[PDB]
Structures are given as C-alpha cells and as structure tokens.
Amino acid sequence: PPEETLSLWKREQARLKAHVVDRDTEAWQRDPAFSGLQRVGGVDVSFVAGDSVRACASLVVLSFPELEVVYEESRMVSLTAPYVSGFLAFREVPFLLELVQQLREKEPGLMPQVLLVDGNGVLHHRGFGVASHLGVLTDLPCVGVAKKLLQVDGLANNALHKEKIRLLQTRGDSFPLLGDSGTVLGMALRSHDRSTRPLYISVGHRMSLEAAVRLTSACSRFRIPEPVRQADICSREHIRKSLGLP
Ligand code: NA
Ligand code: NA
C-alpha cells in the first residue's frame, strides 16, 4: 500500500491505543471463580486455502462455566485491505465488529461479557493488535490468545524461552513475557496437561493480564480454549459448505 496509507493506519492505531484500559473493570473479573461471568465469546478469521482475500469470519458465544455454544454466526468475507505486518487488524476488525453488532441488535441477551480473540493484544509490533483493536471499538473486555510467539519488543523464542517452557508442568502453569525494557507484554500459558506448547496470552482491553490468563485457563477443555476453538471450527465448516469442499 502507499506510504500515506501506512502513515494514517499508524496514526489510527495510536488514536485507538490511547483508549485501551489495561485493568479489570467488572466485578466478575476480580472473583477467583469468575462469579457473575455467564457468557464468553470467541472470534476467528480464517483465510480460504490458496487465497489471501477470501476468508470466513466467525463469532461464537458460550455459556460459562459450562462452555456450551449458545450462539454462532459465520460469514464469508473479502479482506481487501492490503496485508502489512503489524496492521492485520485493519483487515479483520471490520468484519468481526459487524458480527458483534449484529448480535447486539438481534439477541442482546446473548451478548458476551468478554471476547477471546485468536490474535494478540498488547503483545504486538505497536502494542495494539487485533484483540486490542477489536476491544476498544466494541468496548468489550477482550483477551488476545495467540498460538505462536510474536517476536516484538525484544521478545524471542530463544534458549531461555524453551527452558521456561520445559518447566511448565500442568494446565494453568504460566510464565511472564517481559519486553526488553521491563514492560510485561503477556504470559505463556500451559493450557492442557497433555500438551507442551503454550498459548501466548495478552490483554486486549478492559482486563488485567493476570485475570485474562486465569480466564483462558478456565475456558480450556483442550489445548485451544473452547470459545476460540469453536470459532475456528465454525469458520472451517462454513468455508467447506460455501465452497463445496469434501
Ligand atoms: Na457463570
Ligand atoms: Na514440563
């Protein structure tokens, strides 16, 4: 894309990042068992294999703590914004925001109290990933749940990182991800007793990192937390139906 587009995207990230709230704002977030939390949402965008434009965007809502799907919606979309590392949210957030608003008007009684986002929050090139960008615009508590480590602010998958993973033992075990300067950007979380590869959790909006990590653990029946896993499944199924794939 033109340099003017990146410059204005950077400025919009800065505008919105100033609205990120990196503390807990709801009583349910400050309770050990999340008393008062009833619905947790999950979001996904998945590209059609062999394509960088056509994709499926999905929103699911699950009951908590039962983790049963109570709402699901998937839509095929065309991601026409250019792809630039550090700016993925500009491709994906428009469609996820539209799904949340459709829910808010169609069935407000099913609105999630928090979203688990397949993507990063403040652990990001500019401290403002998809989870933070979606969180600020929806004004919903949002957690970034990433399956791989984004190597930003001096973070690296190095010998130290691998030894810290070795010392993770069970579901719920976690260690902090410290930016080169001293800002903790997220946590690596072992989400399942039988998997060694952690998830990388960071604040999106309106949650503390400690609470976000605990919520992600509470939502994990398998390695991928249930709201994220169900949104991924919904997108894959919708693509296969829409394109007639066996
Ligand atoms: Na509950
Ligand atoms: Na271990």
Curated annotation (Swiss-Prot):
InterPro entries reported in the protein's UniProt record: Endonuclease-V
Site (Interaction with target RNA): Y83
Enzyme class at the top of the EC tree: hydrolase
Any one of the GO BP annotations: DNA repair
Cofactor: Mg(2+)
Residues that bind Mg(2+): D44, D118
Annotated Gene Ontology cellular component terms: cytoplasm; cytoplasmic stress granule; nucleolus
Subunit structure: Monomer. Interacts with PABPC1; the interaction is RNA-dependent and stimulates ENDOV activity.
Protein name as catalogued: Endonuclease V
The organism of origin for this protein: Homo sapiens
